[PDB]
Design goal:
The chain is mainly β and 64 residues long. The protein has a single domain, classed as SH3 Domains (SH3 type barrels), CATH 2.30.30.40. Helix content is 6%, strand content 39%. A 5-stranded antiparallel β-sheet has the order 4-3-2-1-5, with no helix packed on it. A hairpin with a 5-residue loop joins strand 2 and strand 3. It is classed as signaling protein. The entry lists the keywords Three-dimensional structure, Cell signaling, signaling protein.
């Protein structure tokens, strides 16, 4: 609903990614994430349901 979506900048995962550290997410192509921080050009902090962590920016497409 709207409370879940409000303020949220969404991302599409373009390629599967397997975490390589405890602060990284594992995701699949097609997953929809929320952007938390894009200040690092190589690594973006993201949110997926109850998880917050990093994925490489090359694996992500901004939707907003």
């Amino acid at each position: 609903g709207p409370m879940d979506e409000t303020g949220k900048e969404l991302l599409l995962v373009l390629y599967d990614y397997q975490e390589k550290s405890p602060r990284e997410l594992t995701c699949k192509k097609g997953d929809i994430l929320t952007l938390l921080n894009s200040t690092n050009k190589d690594w973006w902090k993201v949110e997926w349901n109850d998880r917050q962590g990093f994925l490489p920016a090359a694996y992500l497409k901004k939707l907003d």
